């Protein structure tokens, strides 16, 4: 009774998340196919993702529950096809900004993928089935990244013929999405807690830490292309993106394996590993070597996933399943307001229009000021 909706939803999650072209994006955008200057990608186009995701977050969250979760999963599958049709044939800077907007829909509509299962499976088969659907997303993007490198290296496949595989993959994803059973109840429509000392405190580090994480991962392929232009030397983006994704998975798994009370060791473990994020972000900035810049990416992604797991674990210790949605929905919206303010001032063309060379001296220092504030907050 639970195996059909999960098999169809896991197949959609696997095929929609398998996109070999993702690691080779800036190499593709700033190439002979859609030759676009680095300053045009970082300061004009990319900011449009956080602006559009911010606006299309509350409406889609309320829409996902009003109409059932299935209608919005089909919408995400369409936005996948539109994004990769423009990413293949669309030309110019203004078309790439539309691609940024449509990817904000793709990222804003994934709420219905994980929220769908709760309304179609029994409560007991929820944590197990929620794990199956989350792990198939990691296996798909870690296998897809490995496929990208194994072709670009041992087969000399053009970046253009990696978006064709990405388009073919998400086109199949929007074939199972039409076959999922339609839910017969939502969480809120058809179905004060922040006062706790822990929940508000733990939500602030989550909201602030994740906002910087999204900012760092945003302009990271631009940094790699700056330290080693893709048209001059070999670039191992696919192998690096796969190992970093795999490394982050083990960091999250290890957090739940060791049984250590996250109250006498909960705040300290978030300052020690937040310092590691800052230390790993200055290395990516101050090093002329591309291998040391790859290693800094591994440590940043692995280290961050080791705390978002601890922050999430502590947040969700007394809340119901119904209160996860509207507590993790606010935190994801606060993190976007933080990200938008940082993007407007730092990266946006109308703001400071800082290049990617100096940007990581800001992101690295951003994580160093969160550690001090959460270490200087212990005042006596």
């Amino acid at each position, epitope marked *: 009774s639970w195996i059909y909706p999960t098999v169809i939803l896991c197949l959609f999650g696997f095929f929609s998340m398998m996109r070999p072209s993702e690691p080779f994006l800036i190499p593709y955008l700033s190439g002979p196919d*859609k*030759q*676009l*200057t680095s*300053a*045009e990608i970082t300061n004009e186009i990319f900011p449009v993702w956080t602006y559009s995701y911010l606006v299309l977050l509350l409406p889609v969250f309320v829409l996902t529950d009003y109409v059932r979760y299935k209608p919005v999963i089909i919408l995400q599958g369409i936005s996948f096809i539109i994004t990769w049709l*423009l990413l293949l*044939f*669309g*030309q*110019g*800077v*203004k*078309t790439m900004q*539309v691609v940024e907007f449509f990817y904000g829909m793709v990222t804003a509509a994934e709420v219905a993928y994980y929220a769908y299962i709760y309304s179609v499976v029994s409560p007991e088969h929820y944590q197990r089935v929620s794990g199956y659907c989350r792990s198939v997303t990691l296996a798909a993007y870690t296998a897809g990244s490995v496929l990208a490198q194994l072709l670009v290296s041992l087969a000399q496949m053009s970046y253009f013929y990696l978006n064709v595989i990405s388009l073919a993959s998400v086109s199949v994803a929007f074939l199972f999405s039409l076959f999922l059973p339609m839910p017969k109840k939502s969480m809120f429509f058809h179905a004060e807690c922040y006062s706790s000392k822990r929940l508000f405190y733990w939500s602030l580090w989550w909201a602030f830490a994740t906002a910087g994480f999204n900012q760092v991962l945003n302009y990271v392929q631009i940094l790699w292309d700056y330290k080693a232009p893709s048209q001059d030397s070999s670039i191992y983006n696919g192998a690096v993106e796969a190992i970093a994704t795999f490394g982050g998975a083990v960091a999250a798994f290890a957090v739940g394996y060791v049984k250590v009370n996250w109250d006498l060791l909960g705040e300290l473990a978030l300052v020690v590993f937040s310092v590691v994020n800052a230390g790993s972000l200055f290395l990516m900035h101050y090093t002329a070597n591309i291998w040391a810049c790859y290693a800094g990416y591994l440590i940043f992604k692995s280290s961050y996933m080791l705390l978002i797991t601890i922050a999430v674990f502590q947040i969700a210790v007394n809340l119901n399943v119904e209160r996860y949605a509207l507590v993790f929905g606010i935190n994801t919206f606060i993190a976007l307001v933080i990200q938008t303010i940082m993007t407007v001032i730092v990266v946006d063309q109308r703001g400071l229009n800082l290049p990617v060379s100096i940007q990581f001296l800001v992101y690295g220092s951003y994580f160093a000021v969160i550690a001090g504030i959460f270490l200087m907050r212990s005042m006596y």
Partner: nanobody
Amino acid sequence: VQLVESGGGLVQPGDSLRLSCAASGRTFSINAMAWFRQAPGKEREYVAQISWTGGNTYYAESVKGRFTISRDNAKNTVYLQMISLKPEDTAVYYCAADSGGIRLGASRWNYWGQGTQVTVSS
């Protein structure tokens, strides 16, 4: 837009050359212009790029440091000043405008110029 070039010719080594590009006809929607190069028995080669609304420039590594691309919106012309020429530069230099809008196409550059001849030799 109808891009017509000027300023080509034969110049010894060490002499300069300024090339113009008078865009006209639908000049209202231009957001980037570039210069390309096609040496004899070769393919088109990127040489430079200038943004219209702003002024941000972008040069090919080989030609950087002696090529300078500037806009003159007032008259809608685009220039390319080339210094310290050597006999390995001789080519046909083309304009390329990326006019604007949401478009599907194979090249970022919609319209192209006729070409201007640079014959560096002695």
